[PDB]
Amino acid sequence: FPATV
Amino acid sequence: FPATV
Amino acid sequence: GAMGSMERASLIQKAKLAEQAERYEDMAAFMKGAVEKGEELSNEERNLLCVAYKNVVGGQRAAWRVLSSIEQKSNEEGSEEKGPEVREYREKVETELQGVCDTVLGLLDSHLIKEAGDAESRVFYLKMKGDYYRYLAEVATGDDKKRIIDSARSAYQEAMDISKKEMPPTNPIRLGLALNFSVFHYEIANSPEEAISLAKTTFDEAMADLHTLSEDSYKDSTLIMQLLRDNLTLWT
Amino acid sequence: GAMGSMERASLIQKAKLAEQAERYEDMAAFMKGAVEKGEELSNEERNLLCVAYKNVVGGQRAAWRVLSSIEQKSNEEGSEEKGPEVREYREKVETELQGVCDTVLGLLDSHLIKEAGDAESRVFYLKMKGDYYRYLAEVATGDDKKRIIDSARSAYQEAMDISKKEMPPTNPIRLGLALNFSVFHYEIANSPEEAISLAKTTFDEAMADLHTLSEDSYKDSTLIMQLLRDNLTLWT
Ligand SMILES: *SCCNC(=O)c1ccccc1Sc1ccccc1C#N
Ligand SMILES: *SCCNC(=O)c1ccccc1Sc1ccccc1C#N
Ligand SMILES: [Mg+2]
Ligand SMILES: [Mg+2]
């Protein structure tokens, strides 16, 4: 999965 | 800590 | 609410203790109680709210993906009929996840967003609103799925408009918003080109502003810039 | 109970799904519901019960140790008075932990142990009773602390007596019981010499019986023998 903050 | 199962 | 009798300061203190103990459900309940005291949140307190629900909903999403994958495999040709249990349990986890998202969206709507006047708080809360609509969209399949997606988009867009007007391109809140909106484009809105364009433009405009920053600000901004680069590497 | 309307087989199926999703609180609730159907548990089902509560109570113990350490530091000379919050939150986690232990001990007493006739099930359940009294002892400080410790000891001792009579020295249940009873001696009963003697004698007598085992049984037994050796290395 892609990075999120 | 020591190992327990 | 069960936290109504506890002091705001004690709730914040115990949220930090819960974080140290990796008790994120407790941490979220404490921060929910703190928000419901009705006062605005400081920068540090907004971080605690973010951390608590990110960990809680992150675990729920991970579990939902495991169960959804098992469910998809059970609905393949030649798969043995195992009964309703997989769907039931996926629905159970999905319902708890939706409950957490509705809780967060409820705190933002009552009344965090309407009282947030500074760009730092307003962009933070509107990004959060986009995030938790995005998690609702990840599990949505019904009549309102397009409306859930558009609720995420609308919150993100309002946060973007403010962040571009009121924050420098290296601001970590602005960067984190762009990171997540880019992921929204890629994974939710079926718009990989918009996702890639946003991540690249955000990265390049932050790069050009790094020269203005102190060492400690530089560290925060480059950390998120690397997350943009990581996603771009995944997508290209 | 909330699981009373769900089929026993569906509860077992969902316990395995919860394990795959790392949803151990759910897994424990499903296995509690399965036990409360009143039928005896198979070997596989006993394993699921063990796994679920081990993960739940293991997380609670880890959190309790973090909070207890913070609390001890706050009660040091020159430490700033921070109020009752640390003690309150440690007590909250401690109370939830005790609740889980009481639940497990309740399942064993109503009526898993009294219906367990085979050595494999009876030793498993009596070891489990010793384990969850041991976790109660870890947090105990009151009038019944010695009685809690002796309840752990008594359950372990009955399991040991049966295991020595009815199982070979390489039996993994027998080995795991000896491992944990040895830890009870070291950490709970202030008897490190008994802890070391038990771990060493258990290791040596299993070593001498390995030649009787198949490859797959050998793997199970040597895995636990290495845990005995690891503890001995910690203690000597
Ligand atoms: S949930 C806590 C982690 N995320 C964030 O802190 C967050 C939230 C909203 C927008 C950006 C970010 S990331 C951030 C924010 C400030 C300072 C550093 C960083 C980072 N990395
Ligand atoms: S909670 C699940 C992990 N523990 C055990 O499986 C357990 C329980 C009781 C006694 C011993 C053991 S360890 C064991 C048991 C059977 C086969 C292999 C192993 C191992 N390792
Ligand atoms: Mg649903
Ligand atoms: Mg107490």
Side-chain angles (χ1 to χ4, degrees):
Chain A
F1 53 84
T4 52
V5 298
Chain B
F1 53 84
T4 52
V5 298
Chain C
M3 300 300 175
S5 65
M6 201 186 308
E7 289 275 20
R8 188 188 191 277
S10 302
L11 288 161
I12 296 301
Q13 184 178 352
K14 295 183 182 175
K16 295 171 183 173
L17 292 171
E19 184 182 23
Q20 293 181 262
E22 301 178 76
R23 295 265 299 192
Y24 294 107
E25 178 176 310
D26 288 350
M27 192 191 179
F30 290 140
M31 288 312 300
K32 179 181 190 284
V35 168
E36 290 172 352
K37 299 300 180 179
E39 307 283 342
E40 301 185 20
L41 303 187
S42 68
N43 183 85
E44 184 178 5
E45 296 161 354
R46 293 193 296 273
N47 180 76
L48 293 170
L49 181 73
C50 177
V51 166
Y53 281 107
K54 179 168 176 67
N55 278 273
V56 168
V57 81
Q60 298 174 316
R61 295 160 73 209
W64 184 94
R65 292 183 189 198
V66 165
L67 300 174
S68 184
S69 172
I70 294 166
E71 185 179 16
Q72 303 315 129
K73 293 193 173 75
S74 77
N75 293 320
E76 273 175 8
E77 99 178 323
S79 189
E80 207 47 63
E81 175 64 58
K82 298 307 191 346
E85 287 87 358
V86 172
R87 172 189 57 78
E88 288 170 352
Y89 186 44
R90 189 267 301 156
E91 288 176 334
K92 176 200 180 71
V93 173
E94 177 173 307
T95 299
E96 296 185 11
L97 185 156
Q98 290 167 327
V100 167
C101 293
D102 290 344
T103 288
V104 171
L105 294 166
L107 298 170
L108 297 168
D109 201 49
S110 306
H111 300 274
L112 286 170
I113 287 168
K114 68 172 57 67
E115 294 301 338
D118 294 356
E120 192 99 349
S121 57
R122 189 159 193 88
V123 175
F124 176 93
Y125 291 135
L126 285 164
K127 169 192 166 294
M128 194 167 199
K129 179 174 183 171
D131 290 335
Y132 284 82
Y133 273 113
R134 170 160 57 89
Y135 309 147
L136 289 178
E138 285 176 338
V139 308
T141 55
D143 279 0
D144 53 358
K145 178 190 168 62
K146 284 175 177 160
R147 267 181 288 268
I148 293 166
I149 289 174
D150 203 67
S151 288
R153 181 208 57 76
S154 183
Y156 281 135
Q157 189 61 60
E158 180 173 355
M160 290 285 323
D161 294 346
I162 299 173
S163 77
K164 283 163 141 213
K165 202 201 291 334
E166 304 292 343
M167 295 166 152
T170 47
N171 181 283
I173 305 201
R174 177 171 168 178
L175 293 174
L177 161 66
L179 180 80
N180 289 19
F181 195 18
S182 167
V183 163
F184 165 85
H185 288 309
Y186 195 90
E187 294 282 338
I188 309 298
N190 197 34
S191 304
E193 288 182 331
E194 185 72 16
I196 292 156
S197 295
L198 178 54
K200 178 158 204 316
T201 289
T202 301
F203 180 98
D204 294 346
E205 291 169 16
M207 176 74 67
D209 189 56
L210 291 174
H211 74 276
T212 67
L213 300 183
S214 69
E215 194 168 326
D216 285 358
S217 298
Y218 175 93
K219 169 174 288 272
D220 289 339
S221 302
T222 58
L223 191 152
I224 307 177
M225 289 172 63
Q226 184 59 53
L227 298 178
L228 290 159
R229 175 64 46 193
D230 292 341
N231 284 357
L232 283 166
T233 297
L234 284 183
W235 297 338
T236 57
Chain D
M3 300 300 175
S5 65
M6 201 186 308
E7 289 275 20
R8 188 188 191 277
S10 302
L11 288 161
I12 296 301
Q13 184 178 352
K14 295 183 182 175
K16 295 171 183 173
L17 292 171
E19 184 182 23
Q20 293 181 262
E22 301 178 76
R23 295 265 299 192
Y24 294 107
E25 178 176 310
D26 288 350
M27 192 191 179
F30 290 140
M31 288 312 300
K32 179 181 190 284
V35 168
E36 290 172 352
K37 299 300 180 179
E39 307 283 342
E40 301 185 20
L41 303 187
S42 68
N43 183 85
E44 184 178 5
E45 296 161 354
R46 293 193 296 273
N47 180 76
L48 293 170
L49 181 73
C50 177
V51 166
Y53 281 107
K54 179 168 176 67
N55 278 273
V56 168
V57 81
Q60 298 174 316
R61 295 160 73 209
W64 184 94
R65 292 183 189 198
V66 165
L67 300 174
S68 184
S69 172
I70 294 166
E71 185 179 16
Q72 303 315 129
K73 293 193 173 75
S74 77
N75 293 320
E76 273 175 8
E77 99 178 323
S79 189
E80 207 47 63
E81 175 64 58
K82 298 307 191 346
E85 287 87 358
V86 172
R87 172 189 57 78
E88 288 170 352
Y89 186 44
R90 189 267 301 156
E91 288 176 334
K92 176 200 180 71
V93 173
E94 177 173 307
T95 299
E96 296 185 11
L97 185 156
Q98 290 167 327
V100 167
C101 293
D102 290 344
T103 288
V104 171
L105 294 166
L107 298 170
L108 297 168
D109 201 49
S110 306
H111 300 274
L112 286 170
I113 287 168
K114 68 172 57 67
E115 294 301 338
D118 294 356
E120 192 99 349
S121 57
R122 189 159 193 88
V123 175
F124 176 93
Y125 291 135
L126 285 164
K127 169 192 166 294
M128 194 167 199
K129 179 174 183 171
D131 290 335
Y132 284 82
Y133 273 113
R134 170 160 57 89
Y135 309 147
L136 289 178
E138 285 176 338
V139 308
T141 55
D143 279 0
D144 53 358
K145 178 190 168 62
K146 284 175 177 160
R147 267 181 288 268
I148 293 166
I149 289 174
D150 203 67
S151 288
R153 181 208 57 76
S154 183
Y156 281 135
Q157 189 61 60
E158 180 173 355
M160 290 285 323
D161 294 346
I162 299 173
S163 77
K164 283 163 141 213
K165 202 201 291 334
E166 304 292 343
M167 295 166 152
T170 47
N171 181 283
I173 305 201
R174 177 171 168 178
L175 293 174
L177 161 66
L179 180 80
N180 289 19
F181 195 18
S182 167
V183 163
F184 165 85
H185 288 309
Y186 195 90
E187 294 282 338
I188 309 298
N190 197 34
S191 304
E193 288 182 331
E194 185 72 16
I196 292 156
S197 295
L198 178 54
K200 178 158 204 316
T201 289
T202 301
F203 180 98
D204 294 346
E205 291 169 16
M207 176 74 67
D209 189 56
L210 291 174
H211 74 276
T212 67
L213 300 183
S214 69
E215 194 168 326
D216 285 358
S217 298
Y218 175 93
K219 169 174 288 272
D220 289 339
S221 302
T222 58
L223 191 152
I224 307 177
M225 289 172 63
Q226 184 59 53
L227 298 178
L228 290 159
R229 175 64 46 193
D230 292 341
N231 284 357
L232 283 166
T233 297
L234 284 183
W235 297 338
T236 57

